[PDB]
Amino acid sequence: GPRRGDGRRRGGGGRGQ
RNA sequence: GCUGCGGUGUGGAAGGAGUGGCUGGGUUGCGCAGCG
């Protein structure tokens, strides 16, 4: 549940770059 | 912010996390979830 709203690059894998 | 999820696509009614991908939809699209 992200309360910041910034929206960081998802970890896990490449996806999020 | 920090991390994770083949999970969802302009294939995900099939992989795998790039540990194939910086043209192939892509300098790893798009969303979602967890923690403050």
Experimental method: NMR
The span from the CA of A7 to the CA of A11, in Å, is 12
Breaks (C-N over 2.5 A) in chain A follow: none
- As a rounded value in angstroms, the CA-to-C1' distance for A17 and B4 is 14
- The 3-state DSSP composition of chain A as helix, strand, coil percent (nearest 5) reads 0, 0, 100
The span from the CA of A9 to the CA of A14, in Å, is 9
Residue nearest to nucleotide B29 (CA to C1'): A15
Q: Are A9 and A17 in contact (CB under 8 A)?
A: yes
Q: How is residue A4 written in tokens? A: 């910041």
A12 Cβ neighbours under 8 A, 6+ residues apart: none
State the DSSP string of A1-17. Answer: ---S---PPPSSSSTT-
Query: Closest nucleotide to A17's CA, by C1' atom?
Result: B28
Q: How is residue A1 written in tokens? A: 């549940």
The span from the CA of A11 to the CA of A5, in Å, is 16
Phi, psi of A11 (to 5 degrees): -70, -120
